[PDB]
Each structure stands twice: as structure tokens, then as C-alpha cells.
Swiss-Prot record, chain B:
UniProt miscellaneous comment: Unlike their eukaryotic orthologs the putative Burkholderia deoxyribonuclease-2 are probably not secreted from the cell, as they do not have a signal sequence.
EC number: 3.1.-.-
Keyword Nuclease found: yes
Enzyme class (EC, first level): hydrolase
UniProt-listed PANTHER family: DEOXYRIBONUCLEASE II (PTHR10858:SF23)
One Gene Ontology molecular-function label: deoxyribonuclease II activity
Domain of life: Bacteria
Keywords on record: Endonuclease, Hydrolase, Nuclease
Protein name: Putative deoxyribonuclease-2
InterPro entries: DNase_II
Annotated family: Belongs to the DNase II family.
Length: 348, 346
């Protein structure tokens, strides 16, 4: 009854991760993937595996987690929802200056418990309308078990840097002095620095960092902030960070050759797809097993808006994500030539 | 020194059209096309053919036309520039409630002459100062008299509501509709669309068919087609996103399916329609060619914009024959065409 992430069988769990696949076409009558299939990971199952559920079913870690919050809240249960693209039932108009951060912070004062769900779905989530979010993209999800003090400290950072667009909150009787309450009130883009990083732990003791940029930041979020904060290089060499132009097949006909693919087949999830059909808001380091899941994608071109990423160390998840790389060269080209075309997208 | 479109040899011409190719690559070290190559058409040459020039050269119809305006203007020469994405030297934030329209109206009051250049480049043009080469684009440039340019300006003030920047009035009287286009656009438009008939100085009839920000229907099938009393040729248009499709190696990939192919016009390139601004269309009969501000996507913002429509059997046939359909692996031409039509769904 304390607020907690829920796993695939509705059991309380300290942390979970999911990678949802995009909608993928088999033929005119059927999809290979609807876009709600996913792989699931937590440290109890100990492996990244294909889920038997669809994410929009009323089953699986996402539903069980959010239903445990919204379904029958206590007198001191509350929540903060935010999204730069709010769902249709939101209680405010859009503010285009706020951060491109999306998520849910839920809490219960009496039990001193909280959770944080990070996702990248536009128009999600709603506390009373099961909205149908888009199936078209690969996406990642991270859900963490928190104590109330950690949720408050996180909300204080977000009020300063990420500056999320908060909608339909429930305060559960919070003191107006609480940073959780302050996050529901108007924000001031005032901080003099351009970034911030904080250390936290889950209730289970798993260390993580929240690494944020604000509207002043104009450099490379990944190589100039995240990497240096982790004291490790981001593994970027096969990232798509811009557009590859159409590539010649033959006789002057140029086609999309994606070159870089994300491949989950080693995890029992029988799908591989272009990185351009992926939100690509995760990254790993080349050493020390850091996994980052967050608000900011891999494109060199970015807006001057707040946002951040969660970083934590996980050898098992790091290995699984490392092994999702798939490089397919265009016709007549080598692997080295394909890698050079990918790296060219890193040029501004 | 009367204002006029200039052709590929820097001679005055009543009308010209250009189709610029996107940047196209062979590998990381070589490109098949820089994205400044183009085919050119006017009624004097009477053929749609690849230009010897690049559009960023200090020659060719685009350079010669704009240089005849910006290069050494007389005291009565002026211009209205507009773009929903203003260039950097405007030093102003964009107003997203104004129209998609991009272009240049230039004029000289002493000679009662004007020209209209329609283009689709963001952040362009600037009277003193590199536009993206990444997309296929169309251009149209028309010779107008000052009265016609003012009638067009009056329509724009109501419907397209273009975002004007760095104007030069050339001493325009403030009661001119051209001058009003440089002032804040506050007039309320009646209805959600408008269509007007015009002619070039050379007598070529054209229509300007415009929607305003209250329009929420299909610009092409519900406004343009009915205005022209013809059907738009849309059956192979990409009007939405096609998901990745399964290949035999077990991986899902981008298959473009619909390509734009200029090889029969001497330009040895074909490319995905998704790498094309696709702001042109033709009808199935009566030889209508439309070049404008509005692309083919079903999803549209509620903002102003329009298209220029005129009849030209020669350009119509050239554009019609640029279709190229390539099915995904294992699929037939019929299945490919059904996948394209699927992008037309609401």
C-alpha cells in the first residue's frame, strides 16, 4: 500500500525498465509489431526479456504501476504529471517555453513513499482517461522507488532546470512549503548555471544521478555534460545524430538506407528497426556500465529548453543495450563505409 | 530597368519555373547531387530541362532575378519579403500564427512594374546576405504590374497573412496595399478561403488559391480541385508516414515506395518523395500546374497559405511523368500503390 513501482505481476519492485518497439509492417493485412510490445527488465528477473503483455493492456508493469497510484488513492496520496505535449484532458493551455520532459511523480505522505516514472510518450499520462498514446516509435521507460525526501529534492531540481509543464496534479495535503507543491506553481527560468547534476538512491539503495540541462544550455548534452559528469565516454560512434541523405542504389535512383538499426532479437523480442523510428532517448557509456534513460535524444540539433536524463550503473542492462547495435551497409558498401556515413551525421 | 523575372541568360522573361533536386549521396566522401542542381522551364525555351547552373551560383535565373532587385535598386524600387521562418538578419522571433507563405514581391513605382518569386526555403531571402540544400523544391517567378501586385497584397493581408520582414518601401504611398502588407496584419477574413484570378504582364492567366487560419479541410481536394473544376492527381501522393517494412534478412527498414524521378528531363536523379517539399500538384485533366506554400500531408497546421495555379500542357506532362513506384521486397506494384494510398487516411 506504500507507493512503489509494480512489476509484470503487480508485485512491488525497486526499479524497472522497458523498451517498447515501434509499429512495424509485415504486409497489407498484418503488422509484425503493433507498437505496444516490449522487453522488460528489473533486478529480480535479472534478464532483459520479451514481455507477454502489450503496454496498453490493463496488465504489465506500466499499467500495474500507474493503476496502483491513480486507481484508489489515499487521503495523503498525490501526484505530479508533466509533459510538453499534454493529454487532451489537461487543465491548462500549452506553454511552448517549458522543458521537453515527460513523466509522473507519485507520493503518499502518510507512508513516506513515492515513485517516479520517466517516459517519452506525448499526451500521456492522464489520471482518469486511459489515453491511447502513439505506437509508432521505439521508446524507453524507467520507473524508480523513492522516499518522499528524494522526490522533494528531485522536484526542487526540476523547478530550477528541467522546468516541466505540470498538469492535473494532486497535492494530497502537501504543505505549500514542500518543493513538491512548488513544482505545481508558476516557474521562473532564472538559474545562472546552464546545467545541474544530483545523486540519489532508490529505496532499495540503488544509486542514480539526475543530470539536467536548462534553457541556457547550448552545447552537446551527451558529450559535454553527461559524459563528463559520469567520468566516462558516451558510446556515440554509431549514433544517428542527424539525417543521412538518400543514398544511390543504381541508375540514379536514390533511396533511404537507414544503415543503423536497433535489434532486440538476441533478447527474444523478434524485431529490429531503423534508429530513425526510435525516440532514441537512451544511451550507454563505453566503460563502467552506465545506462542513461531520459528526455533528450541523440540529435545534434536541439532546442533551448530544459530536460535531463537518469543515469545508473547496471552491468546486465548495459550489456543488453550494447548488443542491440545492428549496422547494415548500403549496397556495395563496406562496414567501415557505413560507419563513416553514420559518423557524418554528427557534424552540425 | 523595369522589374521582371530574369531567365537563365539574364534576359527579362514573363514567367519561369524551377525544380531543385535534394542533396543525394553515394557515400560519406562523394555526393551524386549537392542539392543545388535543378531543371528549368519557361515558355520561350519551351522545354523542361536540366540547368547547366547551380542555384547558389552567381548566375542562373534565381541569381539573375534577385540580383536585378537587390543589387542596385533605384530610389523607387522596393520589396516585401516574407517567410514563416525569418532569416537570422531579421533579428526577430517567429510568430507561429502567421501563414506558411514564403516569397518575395519586388516592385518599382516609377515604372509601375513588379515581380513575384515563390519559393519554399526557410530563412530566405535576405537582401544583403546559405539556404538548406537537403530537399527537392519548386520555384515560380511571375511578371506583374503594380496593380496586380497590390491586389495580391490585399489578398495576403486577409488570408495567407505572411510574416513580413526587412521590407523596403521605395517611397510607397501609405495607402497602397503593398505598404499595408508591411504593417501589422489585423484584418479579419470572411470565411476560411479565397481565390482570385490574375494575369502576368505577358497575359498568362493564373489563380492564387488561398486558405486562412480557420481552414481545417483538405486544401487540395476540398479547395484547389473544386476551384479549378478539376480533380487533383493525388492517387500516388505521400500524405502521411509509411511504417518500416520487413525485409528478408529479418530486419524492418524504410521503403520509400513513392519516388520523384527527373531522369526523363535530363536530370539523372530520382529520390524519395519524403525528401521533397512536395508543395506542387497537378490535375488529372485540363493541364493545371499548382506551385505553392502547402504540401501534400493530411496533417496540417491551422495557418494561412496558398498555391499558384496555371495551365501549361508542356510543364504538366513533364511533372506527370516524374512518378516512380518501387515496391518493398516481395510486394507487387499493386501492393505498393495500396501502401501509398494508406497514407491518405484521416
Amino acid at each position: 500500500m506504500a507507493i512503489s513501482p509494480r512489476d509484470e505481476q503487480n508485485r512491488s519492485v525497486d526499479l524497472w525498465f522497458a523498451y517498447k518497439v515501434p509499429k512495424l509492417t509485415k504486409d497489407a493485412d498484418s503488422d509484425s509489431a503493433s507498437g505496444y510490445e516490449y522487453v522488460y527488465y528489473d533486478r529480480q528477473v535479472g534478464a532483459v526479456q520479451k514481455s507477454p503483455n502489450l503496454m496498453n493492456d490493463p496488465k504489465g508493469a506500466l499499467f500495474y504501476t500507474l493503476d496502483s497510484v491513480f486507481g484508489d488513492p489515499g487521503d495523503t496520496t498525490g501526484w505530479i504529471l508533466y509533459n510538453d505535449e499534454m493529454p487532451a484532458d489537461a487543465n491548462r493551455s500549452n506553454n511552448a517555453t517549458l522543458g521537453h520532459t515527460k513523466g509522473v511523480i507519485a507520493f503518499d505522505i502518510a507512508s513516506s513513499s513515492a515513485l517516479w516514472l520517466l517516459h517519452s510518450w506525448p499526451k500521456y499520462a492522464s489520471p482518469s482517461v486511459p489515453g491511447v498514446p502513439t505506437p509508432l516509435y521505439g521508446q524507453t521507460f524507467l520507473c524508480l522507488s523513492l522516499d518522499l525526501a528524494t522526490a522533494g529534492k528531485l522536484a526542487a531540481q526540476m523547478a530550477l532546470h528541467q522546468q516541466p509543464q505540470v498538469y492535473l496534479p494532486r497535492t494530497g495535503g502537501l504543505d505549500h512549503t514542500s518543493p513538491l507543491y512548488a513544482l505545481t506553481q508558476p516557474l521562473n527560468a532564472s538559474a545562472p548555471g546552464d546545467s545541474d547534476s544530483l545523486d540519489f538512491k532508490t529505496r532499495g539503495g540503488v544509486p542514480f544521478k539526475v543530470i539536467a540541462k536548462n534553457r541556457k544550455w547550448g552545447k552537446d548534452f551527451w558529450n559535454d555534460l553527461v559524459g563528463p559528469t559520469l567520468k566516462a565516454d558516451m558510446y556515440v560512434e554509431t549514433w544517428i545524430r542527424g539525417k543521412i541523405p538518400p543514398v544511390l542504389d543504381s541508375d540514379g535512383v536514390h533511396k533511404t538506407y537507414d544503415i543503423k538499426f536497433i535489434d532486440l532479437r538476441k533478447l527474444g523480442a523478434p524485431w529490429a528497426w531503423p534508429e530513425t523510428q526510435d525516440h532514441a532517448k537512451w544511451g550507454i557509456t563505453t566503460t563502467d556500465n552506465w545506462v542513461c534513460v531520459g528526455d533528450i535524444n541523440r540529435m545534434v540539433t536541439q532546442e533551448k529548453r530544459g530536460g535531463g536524463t537518469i543515469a545508473f550503473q547496471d552491468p546486465k542492462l548495459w550489456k543488453a543495450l550494447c548488443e542491440t547495435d545492428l549496422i547494415i551497409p548500403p549496397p556495395g558498401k563496406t562496414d567501415a563505409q557505413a560507419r563513416a556515413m553514420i559518423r557524418k551525421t554528427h557534424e552540425p
